[PDB]
Design a protein around this nucleic acid. Structure first.
Lengths: 99, 110, 60, 143, 128, 101, 84
RNA sequence: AAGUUGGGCACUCUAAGUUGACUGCCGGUGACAAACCGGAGGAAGGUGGGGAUGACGUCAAAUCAUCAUGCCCCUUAUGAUUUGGGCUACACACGUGCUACAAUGGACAAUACAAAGGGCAGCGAAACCGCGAGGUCAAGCAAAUCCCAUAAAGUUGUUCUCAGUUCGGAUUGUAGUCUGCAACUCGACUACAUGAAGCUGGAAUCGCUAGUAAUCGUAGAUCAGCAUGCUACGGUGAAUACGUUC
């Protein structure tokens, strides 16, 4: 019954500091905020070979981080509406507004 | 013999004593023995003349004989004769999809 | 050959599938993803440039 | 370098039976190995009505040599064999001589064997002997 | 009543053990263990905390376990209980920690890696 | 046995010639499961004759190697190396027995 | 297989329906790979580009486990030392 | 019915910052010092587990056919589009690996426990059809929510009672499903039957010091279609390490 969003960053602090400054914007004119609920941060892989032609066995692994970061707030006022849509940087997040 | 087909075994269970005949496997078993409502139970021929009505009647309803070696003979003279791009390959040991003959001595090649 | 295979792939087709998607930068056809359309060794070639995350390396 | 304790066997509150299971525990399938073994208990504890531990300690002590040898060109030496390797020795000659009986069931050959050496018969008592024949034939050229 | 608590973790198999004094009676997720774990008749070793610490016993069992198959799941039982008895009273660390029971042996399945095929073995070599 | 040769199409007189002259060494011991040969041609601009060969062994393998003007003289070298090799490998060894106590 | 049911190249069909009325011709250079049997292609004799060139055949009644996608096994003698 | 409903975040679990294991501390030993053994605590005590990382140089190692490029050469072609074959043929060997040579077994029927990832017109849910393949509509879903999904081995009772076997399913052909217009040379998969050698492999030779070896399955890439391969995930679970003779 409150705002709910999903943040996806590929450097593991911007989720936290961005989450908290926008929380500051959010409780400035408002209150009743649920925190940065962690999600498992699923991964990826790319089994790449250390070669050009042959020697398939000598290989290596690039991968990826895909974090999800679930943040809410209840009891809206249109000023915490602006707390969502007032500050978004660093915008490497996959910011998605909902309710 | 005994009822029909070719060479019913002796003291073998019906559900596979059937499987011996030329063209009976496994699902065929439960079919043709269900069509007489019998059970074997357990390793062994266990028949009397009672269910012989239905085990003798059902077994006549299929081509479990050398007529399947005839109809086989027809399928092969068919396939080989036509041109036949599968009549040369009827002998190599190839199904319809080819088989990339490299390892083959074989069970299906001399 | 190569230079005209480049034009072979990007011109039209008869129907859906007699067509390939090799790598853009290098012409490496085989063993290439469809995510980024980038071959085996172009990603390494441009992984070290570190434009993207990307990681590199060794946790799994 | 130490040797992978078994806590107890929770059957008999023993230890040796587990040490044997782990040689029978093919595929790690203790369920089927302790199956075939428990079957072994009731069967052998039926025939010649007794316990495992009687035919077990008996027959395991009847095949168990107190000597065996080793090479070192290759000169074959007599030595009092150490005890735990002597244990797994009796276990191993036991079971490996067991399966070659040409007998169908999981257990009958086993109880046949421990009952064999229980009366100082069987080829594992025999190999115990030949070990103890080479040994003391092996005293001259090596001791 | 008063349910002591220990929490065990082996092989993806967490053991939220709700130990409580009483009789001693098993519920693997609202279900007795005996029928449950294949086959299995190795439950003597699972009441080991009663075997060697405040022996005999007993205290009553509720337990909320999930993950893995029976084995490491049947091994977080121990650390669940013993950690719950050190939680009960560490009086008997000198008969627990003489049997360990708090060493969650962290061994596991290592990553896969080149050469490893359908079962883990180094390759065969080329010859002659 | 295994013979791949780049920038040239092999012939047959060389086969009987080289492999028979290798067969002469069953004095010691042949033992002839594998015999991998190897060649190439390489502008300098005097421009090549690569003559390279393995002659692998029981429990071990080997290497003889040579570059030449010409394949006959250049081959008499893949042989009159392996000879001395196989010879030693057999001498060796150590028998001068000697009781003990 | 086919998904209910048989197909044909249809540019050959434009040929047969043309040569089908009169005393039917029996000479064809064609392509004949994705064209399976049916009995309007009769009265006409087929030489299909085998992989190198075209190769005739007298069409005949028994043609049931057969089709014109190829009837000349193209591996060309054989490839092999022994015969069949 | 149900963590579903309302309630609680306690607890597993959850992703960020935090110590803890650093011979740190105690005893012995030792040229006292370096340092070795044991002890205490501890979850971890001996570079904790594993990975990342490959010094100087050797192989004129592989690579112009990743990419670029020194020299040479073609340029009505060695350049080019278009359709078809074919890169897959096999008297032969080899190497590689997958699968049986069975009663711990094989087949039947009931039953439980995993992890990890992927998903938009993509993951396909029930209900429906059928021997199955598969198809009907569409529940739910950019995901700790809906789907792939169900786990397999195990266990439960039955039977099989040592065979060339209820082992074996190669083979050949009969019949259906899915793909792409397209399954002949050349996609697998679905029921029918056919049921070969093979009853544990000579000489020879290879890996492995413990959750190993050995063993059962899951999913990702490539992907219209296609894995006895590879990759990642797990679940089950051994013998041996005297001594460095050799």
């Amino acid at each position: 019954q409150k705002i709910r969003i999903r943040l996806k960053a590929y450097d593991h602090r911007v989720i936290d500091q961005s989450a908290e400054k926008i929380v500051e914007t959010a409780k400035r004119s408002g209150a009743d905020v649920s925190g940065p609920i962690p999600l498992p941060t699923e991964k990826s892989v790319y089994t790449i070979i250390r070669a050009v032609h042959m020697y398939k066995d000598s290989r290596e692994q690039f991968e990826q981080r895909t974090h999800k970061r679930l943040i809410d707030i209840v009891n809206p006022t249109p000023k915490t509406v602006d707390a969502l849509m007032g500050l978004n940087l660093p915008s490497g997040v996959d910011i998605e507004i909902k309710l | 013999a005994r009822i029909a087909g070719v060479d019913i075994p002796r003291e073998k269970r019906v559900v596979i004593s059937l499987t011996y005949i030329y063209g009976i496997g496994t699902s065929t078993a439960q079919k043709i023995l269900e069509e007489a409502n019998v059970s074997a139970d357990t390793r062994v021929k266990d028949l009397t003349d009672d269910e012989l009505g239905r085990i003798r009647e059902v077994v006549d309803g299929y081509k479990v004989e050398g007529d399947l070696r005839r109809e086989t003979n027809l399928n092969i003279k068919r396939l080989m004769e036509i041109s036949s791009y599968r009549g040369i390959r009827h002998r190599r040991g190839l199904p319809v999809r080819g088989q990339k003959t490299k390892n083959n001595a074989r069970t299906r090649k001399g | 050959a190569k230079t005209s295979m480049v034009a072979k792939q990007q011109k039209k087709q008869k129907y859906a599938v007699r067509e390939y998607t090799r790598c853009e930068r290098c012409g490496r056809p085989h063993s290439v993803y469809r995510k980024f359309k980038l071959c085996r060794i172009c990603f390494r070639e441009l992984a070290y440039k570190g434009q993207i995350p990307g990681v590199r390396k060794a946790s799994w | 370098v130490p040797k992978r304790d078994v806590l107890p066997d929770p059957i008999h509150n023993s230890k040796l039976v587990t040490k044997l299971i782990n040689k029978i525990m093919l595929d790690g399938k203790r369920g089927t190995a302790q199956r075939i073994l428990y079957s072994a208990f009731d069967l052998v504890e039926q025939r010649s009505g007794r316990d495992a531990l009687e035919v077990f300690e008996e027959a395991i002590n009847n095949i168990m040599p107190v000597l065996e040898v080793k090479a070192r060109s290759n000169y074959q030496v007599p030595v009092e064999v150490r005890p735990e390797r002597r244990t797994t020795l009796g276990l191993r000659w036991l079971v490996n001589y067991a399966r070659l009986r040409g007998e169908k069931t999981m257990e009958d050959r086993l109880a046949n064997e421990i009952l064999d050496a229980a009366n100082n018969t069987g080829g594992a008592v025999k190999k115990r002997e030949d070990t103890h024949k080479m040994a003391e034939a092996n005293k001259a050229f090596a001791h | 009543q008063v349910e002591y608590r220990g929490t065990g973790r082996r092989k993806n198999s967490v053991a939220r053990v709700r130990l409580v004094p009483g009789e001693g009676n098993i519920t693997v997720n609202n279900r007795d263990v005996r029928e449950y774990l294949p086959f299995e008749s190795l439950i003597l070793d699972l009441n080991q905390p009663f075997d060697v610490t405040e022996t005999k016993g007993n205290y009553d069992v509720l337990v909320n376990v999930h993950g893995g198959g029976f084995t490491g799941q049947a091994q977080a039982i121990r650390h669940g209980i013993a950690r719950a008895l050190l939680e009960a009273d560490p009086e008997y660390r000198g008969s627990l920690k003489r049997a360990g029971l708090l060493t969650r042996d962290p061994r596991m399945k290592e990553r896969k890696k080149p050469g490893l095929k359908a079962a883990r073995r180094s390759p065969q070599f080329s010859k002659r | 046995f295994e013979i791949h040769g780049d920038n040239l199409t092999i012939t047959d007189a060389i086969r009987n010639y080289i492999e028979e002259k290798i067969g002469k060494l069953e004095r010691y011991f042949n033992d002839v499961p594998n015999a991998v040969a190897h060649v190439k041609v390489k502008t300098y601009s005097n421009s090549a004759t690569k003559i390279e060969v393995t002659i692998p062994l029981k429990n071990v393998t080997l290497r003889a190697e040579e570059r030449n003007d010409d394949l006959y003289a250049g081959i008499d070298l893949i042989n009159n190396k392996l000879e001395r090799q196989v010879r030693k490998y057999k001498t060796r060894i150590n028998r001068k027995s000697r009781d003990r106590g | 297989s086919i998904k209910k049911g048989p197909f044909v190249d249809e540019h050959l069909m434009k040929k047969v329906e043309a040569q089908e009325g009169s005393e039917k011709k029996q000479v064809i250079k064609t392509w004949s790979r994705r064209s399976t049997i049916f009995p309007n292609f009769i009265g006409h004799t087929f030489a299909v580009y085998d992989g190198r060139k075209h190769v005739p055949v007298y069409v005949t009644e028994d043609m049931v486990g057969h089709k014109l996608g190829e009837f000349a096994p193209t591996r060309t003698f054989k490839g092999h030392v022994a015969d069949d």
